[PDB]
Symmetry: D3
Subunit: 175 residues, 6 copies
């Protein structure tokens, strides 16, 4: 099942991302259930917003919000919920929400899957519009959900993203 997918072939540079929400999809917030490995509806989002990239997590990790670390994966075409993509981290949006510190990694499809994103080496190679759109999404998508909120801290580089991946892998290993 999806429960058994590795964190990656060679963390933190070579990871697998389990996709929960496709890019430019309807505002249904799916989450994989850790007991069954099935995709559950967590929420029907209240704002008229969509995830700007495919969205999911790295298996066998844990953020301080109590769930595996979150990842945004840009692709040329939207991915299937429940599918897995091999990726390379390139940056991170540091942020906190009501459940705890809750960074959003950005990881691009691995070179073996496409050459498309090879030119994206670090956070400044991501389009500025995309980074602005991602930060705006996380700042506002909970605006009509009472008691849910976000504080965006800022964009950091690939090295910061890789440190976040290591920390989150250790957290899962360790409790």
């Amino acid at each position: 099942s999806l429960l058994n997918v590795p964190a990656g072939k060679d963390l933190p540079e070579d990871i697998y991302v389990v996709i929960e929400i496709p890019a430019n999809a309807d505002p249904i917030k799916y989450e994989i259930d850790k007991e069954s490995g099935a995709l559950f509806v967590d929420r029907f989002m209240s704002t008229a917003m969509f995830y700007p990239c495919n969205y999911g997590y790295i298996n066998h990790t844990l953020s301080l919000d109590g769930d595996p670390v979150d990842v945004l994966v840009p692709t040329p075409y939207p991915l299937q919920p429940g599918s897995v993509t091999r990726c390379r981290p390139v940056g991170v949006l540091k942020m906190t929400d009501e459940a705890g510190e809750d960074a959003k990694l950005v990881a691009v499809p691995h070179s073996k899957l496409s050459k498309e994103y090879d030119h994206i080496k670090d956070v400044n190679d991501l389009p500025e519009l995309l980074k602005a759109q991602i930060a705006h999404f996380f700042e506002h998508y909970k605006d009509l959900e009472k008691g849910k909120w976000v504080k965006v801290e800022g964009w950091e580089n690939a090295e910061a993203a890789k440190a976040e991946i290591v920390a989150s892998f250790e957290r899962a290993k360790n409790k």
Copy 2:
């Protein structure tokens, strides 16, 4: 796997529905295989009709047709086949088909997933058009499939829906 999903957090008021067919989808009748938990094609429907709501079942139940009890789930956006949604029963369309008594529960997304359907407390709060469309669908969707047929009995309330859920849970428990 989907085979392991509970019937619900607190049956019969708080249930989980495994989705097989999205709302306003192509006429492919998928069914979860009980041995493997995979989605199989049961039929390519012959009529030019679509399921009026997302369609699926409550795990760990059994109707007299030999399959888990059936559920229609209205949502603002179609659900993914194989996904699970927490719901609250609000009514039932009693009917029989060639395989046996085969009620169609209507359950709305639980308040925790959205406030959208909180105002739907009982069957008379469902839109009349929707209930008419559901009954018409089940009356006609087998019209071009020889030896398959339906007899619709009528709409009943939330309390009837909850009794159906209990009965179907017991049937699975019991044989």
Copy 3:
């Protein structure tokens, strides 16, 4: 052409709405060109937001922003850009943007097209979630477009919507 469509069969209660942007569509802001009647791309929106209803205008009207008065039309299924729907006004979101006062009418499909929205007689019959989502959209969709902005004033009733329709028809008549 679309240039020749009446404002309505019986303004202000019975109107036609020319659709520019479908509900739950990609963020491409189309506008009908008044010289040619063709649909032009005005903008690729920068935020990850979508119009919560079909969006367009009443022909042969003018708002203070210099364009025909704007309308949101809820429907069960998204409409085609460039299509026309007969509608009945039920409420208005008063607001201003960088181009001038720029109210957003809400008009539902006319009874002749469907009975679905007959129960929506006035603004308080619109779902609260929908009204919240519409106001949030207009408050934020220009957040990443420099020099574009909105000030939302508030929701008003059907009678206010009808007065806005009359005023906007007169403005076009008159200059």
Copy 4:
């Protein structure tokens, strides 16, 4: 505009069909307005049914229902509302509805557009399932619209379809 499209290059064998409703689309019944040439919503259909083929009309014709003669066009991929396709008639479903005699021609894409349908020479070359699905659609799609109804008479051949095209062209010519 669409108002100016010929009935065909060489009626009745070589026709143009103006498309109003795509195949396997949402149940929005669009109709071209004869004054403006714009696509108007005639109805949001009440049944959970979809047109089994692209649906539209031959310009410069008239059926006894007061509108141009109706055509179903099978294609490998759905057509755009408001687009025009060159076709060849292969059969007709004779029927009446509340507005008058109202045959449904079946015309396939002309050989110049594709070789796909060349093998369809006459009505018996259409798939039986498709013909059954079309007849079932027209028998039932008005089932929840009070005062709207259909009586299906039966399938007839290409020669009957061509006679219907001639008759309908003459009717428009003549009153």
Copy 5:
């Protein structure tokens, strides 16, 4: 999981096909992972081409390319990735790629799922256009992927397809 699905109810005439890629989908080459049973992205295809039919494999088989034998399944509507369809083989496109001999079976939905394809008894009953399109796809879809290539050998009949199914089942059984 999908790992546990039989090759078929009665190989080689009555098989199950696990679907990885829907018909007329975006060019994302998904493959089921044999360890986890999850759908992984193998590649984002570089050419502007799409699989002409649903595409997948027969479980518990092995081709000389090291993966389960490949199958194309025509259907009236695209299938879900990860779903299973009961099918009947009707022909095979013999070909080799960089990974080894790599035939492409064509199998149609079993009569129990639909009567639509009953008339397809053998390879010459498949539309010529479809067979041409399939061969052209496999000849060209790797044209922009360095070191990936195909040599198409030619179309063969149902009996050849069934022999391929038997051989591939034995290969898996046997090493």
Copy 6:
């Protein structure tokens, strides 16, 4: 109508492109009819290929193939057939087909519509993958259409694209 749209606000740097075929669409080759301004189906393409960008033309121009000069427009989301987008030329794929010399301009959305493509100043700023995909499409999409063919000459810069625009505008002006 679309017949009346200018070639551009300031040719050759500031153009309007009438869209006939959306990006990543079904293989239906639409063309605007010069007499009526309606979208006609020219062909159902025989290969399993899709246009890699939105595709259309500059009004009031003529290529040697007898039709207005062709344009590919990359966008973040596919455009509507029959819509118009303001664009800036950045490069050209020189090629010939059976109808004559038939260059394919590449023009990006104008800065006024989005800042997304501002960084694309000339042909070498287009992604290499995209340019490879476009050339491969035009080399192969007619492979199964007898008597239709293409010879691709090669990619040239923005200045070459602008000269092509001027030449094609003059050709229309002049005969």
